[PDB]
């Protein structure tokens, strides 16, 4: 949430095809949905997570 290197946590908050899950599904108050998404994107730049599942 605040951190992007913890990709266990980030990998919970992402779907099976690399897409960020909405806060309508996972709860996650909007502040942490914003930190979350921004951390997911920083992780996708570092190739810690994938952008998609067809690379």
């Amino acid at each position: 949430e605040i951190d992007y290197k913890d990709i266990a946590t980030l990998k919970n908050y992402i779907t099976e095809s690399g897409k960020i899950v909405p806060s309508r599904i996972t709860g996650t108050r909007a502040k942490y949905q914003r930190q979350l998404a921004r951390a997911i994107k920083r992780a996708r730049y570092l190739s810690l997570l994938p952008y998609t599942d067809r690379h």
Binding site: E16, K19, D53
Partner: protein
Amino acid sequence: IKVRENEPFDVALRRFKRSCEKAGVLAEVRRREFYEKPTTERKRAKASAVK
């Protein structure tokens, strides 16, 4: 995106694509860049979602 299965399998049963891509996401990107119709389509979509 992928599916596989071991030898107990009969039917496709891939409703992973009624989850993400097929129905909405590709039919949406067939037609025009507006900025304008989406602001009102989303306005009346969120104004229709009411009790």
